[PDB]
A paper describes a structure:
Small molecules in the environment can be sensed as attractants or repellents by a repertoire of chemoreceptors termed methyl-accepting chemotaxis proteins (MCPs) or transducer-like proteins (Tlps). Analysis of the crystal structure of the LBDs of C. jejuni Tlp1 and Tlp3 revealed that they have a double Cache (dCache; calcium channels and chemotaxis receptors) fold. dCache domains consist of two tandem subdomains (termed membrane-distal and membrane-proximal) that likely emerged through tandem segmental DNA duplication. We also discovered eight new small-molecule ligands that, in addition to isoleucine, signal through Tlp3 as attractants by binding directly to its LBD, and determined the crystal structures of the respective complexes. The hydrophobic side-chain binding pocket and the conserved protein residues that interact with the ammonium and carboxylate groups of the ligands determine the specificity of this chemoreceptor, which appears to have evolved as a receptor for natural non-polar amino acids.
To identify candidate signal molecules of this class, we generated a virtual library comprising ~2600 L-isoleucine analogues and screened it by docking into the known L-isoleucine binding site of Tlp3 LBD. The three water-soluble compounds with the lowest predicted free energy of binding (4-methyl-L-isoleucine, β-methyl-L-norleucine, and 3-methyl-L-isoleucine) were selected for the subsequent experiments. In the thermal shift assay, the ΔTm values for all three compounds (2.8 °C, 3.7 °C, and 2.0 °C) exceeded the 1.0 °C threshold, suggesting their direct binding to Tlp3 LBD. Among the non-natural amino acids, α-amino-N-valeric acid showed a slightly lower affinity for Tlp3 LBD (168 μM) than isoleucine and leucine, followed by β-methyl-L-norleucine (Kd = 294 μM), 4-methyl-L-isoleucine (Kd = 324 μM), and 3-methyl-L-isoleucine (Kd = 484 μM). The side chain of β-methyl-L-norleucine makes van der Waals contacts with the side chains of Tyr118, Leu128, Leu144, Trp151, and Val171 and approaches within 4.0 Å of the side chains of Gln130 and Asn116. Our crystallographic analysis provided a structural rationale for this phenomenon: the strongly hydrophobic side-chain-binding pocket can expand to accommodate molecules with the carbon backbone of up to five atoms in length, while longer linear side chains (such as that of β-methylnorleucine) are flipped to the outside of the pocket, which reduces favourable van der Waals contacts with the protein and, hence, lowers the binding affinity.
Author numbering: 39 to 132, 137 to 285
The structure:
């Protein structure tokens, strides 16, 4: 009876929408926690007197400890300050030392921090030295208008993937390239799975707009929404409305 099917459809829409929100929140809160951390670090570095910031030895001795304590406080992989001479002061998981081999002026985290007055957030990428996938938060630090260097903080992208996977619902994230990035059902991360149906249904319907689509000639229901450069989706079987 249409009345019954409408009731089930309105219920499941609300539910699935709510769960999609949870996944959206997860991504937002991950980012903002890392941003706040980075901002606080910026502030403590810029607070130092110039004298502590204007020689490399002073950077080592005065900024290094700050990098280290901050790194430990959140269990970041790397926390670092890149200088215009190409050297980096690096605090890494497993005192901080100056490194001259990290080709920083070719790195987006460095370049892009100098082109915005905000924190820059990279797509996930393979960390040069630790060979883990990371998301980097970078920020050009200025003390009274004078550039000191570019701060970077590397957080394992697995941390976000794990958070998303724990969420209720069959929710998942695509990265900026529409490749699968995280999922509650680990099987979805098969790079051979085609997601065209879901992605085409999202493109037709827009953010947070519930839709029908087919899998193996069965009916499924879902929704997606943009969250920063990610696309977050939920889908379920339409058996809840049909049977
Ligand atoms: C070993 C620190 C690497 C940092 C500077 C950064 N993750 C990069 O790959 O450029
Ligand atoms: Cl993020
Ligand atoms: Cl952002
Ligand atoms: Na958080
Ligand atoms: Na991305």
């Amino acid at each position: 009876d249409p009345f019954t099917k409408t009731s089930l459809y309105e219920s499941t829409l609300k539910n699935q929408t709510d769960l999609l929100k949870v996944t959206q929140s997860t991504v937002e809160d991950f980012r903002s926690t890392n941003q706040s951390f980075t901002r606080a670090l910026e502030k403590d570095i810029a607070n130092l007197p110039y004298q502590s910031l204007i020689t490399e030895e002073n950077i080592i001795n005065n900024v290094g400890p700050i990098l280290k304590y901050y790194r430990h406080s959140i269990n970041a992989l790397n926390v670092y300050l890149g200088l215009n001479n190409g050297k980096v002061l690096l605090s890494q998981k497993s005192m901080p030392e100056l490194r001259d081999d990290l080709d920083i002026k070719t790195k987006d985290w460095y370049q892009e921090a100098l082109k915005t007055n905000d924190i820059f957030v990279t797509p996930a990428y393979l960390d040069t030295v630790l060979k883990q996938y990371v998301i980097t938060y970078s920020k050009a630090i200025y003390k009274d208008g004078k550039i000191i260097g570019v701060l970077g903080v590397d957080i394992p992208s697995e941390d976000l993937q794990n958070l998303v996977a724990k969420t209720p619902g069959n929710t998942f994230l695509f990265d900026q390239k529409n490749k699968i990035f995280a999922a509650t059902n680990k099987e979805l991360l098969n790079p051979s799975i085609d997601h065209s149906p879901v992605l085409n249904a999202y493109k037709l319907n827009g953010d947070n707009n519930f839709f029908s689509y087919k899998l193996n000639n069965e009916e499924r229901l879902g929704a997606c929404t943009k969250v920063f450069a990610y696309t977050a989706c939920i889908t379920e079987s339409a058996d809840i409305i049909n049977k």
